[PDB]
Amino acid sequence: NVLTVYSPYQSNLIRPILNEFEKQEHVKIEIKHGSTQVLLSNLHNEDFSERGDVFMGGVLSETIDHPEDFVPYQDTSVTQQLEDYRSNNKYVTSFLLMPTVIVVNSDLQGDIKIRGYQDLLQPILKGKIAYSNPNTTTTGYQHMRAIYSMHHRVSDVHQFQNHAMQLSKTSKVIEDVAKGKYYAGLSYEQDARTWKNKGYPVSIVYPIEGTMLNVDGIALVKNAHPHPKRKKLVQYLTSRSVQQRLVAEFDAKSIRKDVSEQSDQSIENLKNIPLIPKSKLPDIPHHKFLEMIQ
Numbered sequence: 001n002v003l004t005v006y007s008p009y010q011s012n013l014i015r016p017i018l019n020e021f022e023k024q025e026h027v028k029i030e031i032k033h034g035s036t037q038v039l040l041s042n043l044h045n046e047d048f049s050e051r052g053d054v055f056m057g058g059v060l061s062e063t064i065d066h067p068e069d070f071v072p073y074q075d076t077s078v079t080q081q082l083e084d085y086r087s088n089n090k091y092v093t094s095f096l097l098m099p100t101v102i103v104v105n106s107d108l109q110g111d112i113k114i115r116g117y118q119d120l121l122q123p124i125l126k127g128k129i130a131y132s133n134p135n136t137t138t139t140g141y142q143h144m145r146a147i148y149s150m151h152h153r154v155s156d157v158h159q160f161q162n163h164a165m166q167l168s169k170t171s172k173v174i175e176d177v178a179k180g181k182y183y184a185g186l187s188y189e190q191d192a193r194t195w196k197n198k199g200y201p202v203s204i205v206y207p208i209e210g211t212m213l214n215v216d217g218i219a220l221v222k223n224a225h226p227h228p229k230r231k232k233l234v235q236y237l238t239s240r241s242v243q244q245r246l247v248a249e250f251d252a253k254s255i256r257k258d259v260s261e262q263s264d265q266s267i268e269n270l271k272n273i274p275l276i277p278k279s280k281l282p283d284i285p286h287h288k289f290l291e292m293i294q
């Protein structure tokens with residue numbers, strides 16, 4: 001009856017289009033939410049027979065520690081995807097492009113300038129910046145990579161961590177910044193846009209030193225009784241019309257070549273974002289980088 005999806009995404013991004021899939025395909029979709037690595041660890045310890053069917057969200061092509069929990073599968077539409085971001089992981093289909101961002105409370109900021117990671121180290125901001133657990137979250141892990149990528153110095157990562165408060169959940173960062181508990185935080189584009197569009201005093205900052213771009217992925221979960229419509233769901237989520245819907249409604253950044261680019265107001269087009277070049281990312285395993293910065 002039920003197709004189960006693991007997703008670190010928030011409900012407001014995926015519940016509507018997953019509802020549209022229910023309406024079109026007459027299948028009931030339930031979502032298991034959580035931090036990326038928490039979902040992957042819970043999935044790993046799940047019986048084959050209780051497991052869900054699809055994992056969507058997170059930098060799956062680079063942070064799946066147990067490939068034996070997934071089925072080798074990429075959607076056929078990878079041929080229509082942007083050349084620079086096609087998954088090199090046979091278990092993962094690229095789904096969305098998600099810039100990681102700095103979020104600033106524009107009511108608390110005042111005259112303080114925050115242009116990137118270096119500005120977060122200003123003494124006035126000490127202990128008043130937040131980020132999420134790099135061991136459990138995609139956002140915290142990708143931000144620590146971005147800081148390390150600046151000069152490939154672990155001391156830069158430690159300097160930031162000694163300056164900021166680590167939170168358990170990524171979405172707690174944007175909530176506490178938007179509500180005025182912190183001056184700034186390390187978040188991602190869609191989560192920042194959710195609260196800014198709700199009227200909260202939130203500024204979205206793309207770090208001038210280099211903005212990490214997440215290639216979010218979709219993967220089929222190895223279970224005993226896979227729902228036979230799960231490949232239709234992956235095709236649905238990576239299709240042109242559905243990707244166009246995500247772009248039009250959320251200012252999402254599509255993985256496809258044949259979908260519009262939309263950067264309403266303070267959301268920036270990828271061409272105007274100082275992305276960290278691939279050549280600056282050292283190609284270091286997920287677990288090893290976490291050992292490096294511990």
Ligand SMILES: O=P(O)(O)OC[C@H]1O[C@@H](O)[C@H](O)[C@@H](O)[C@H]1O
Pocket residue numbers: 008009034035036037057058059098100132136137138139140142169170171188214216
């Ligand atoms: O709670 P998490 O693990 O940070 O995940 C929440 C989100 O983080 C972003 O960085 C990713 O681009 C999203 O795909 C999603 O994973």
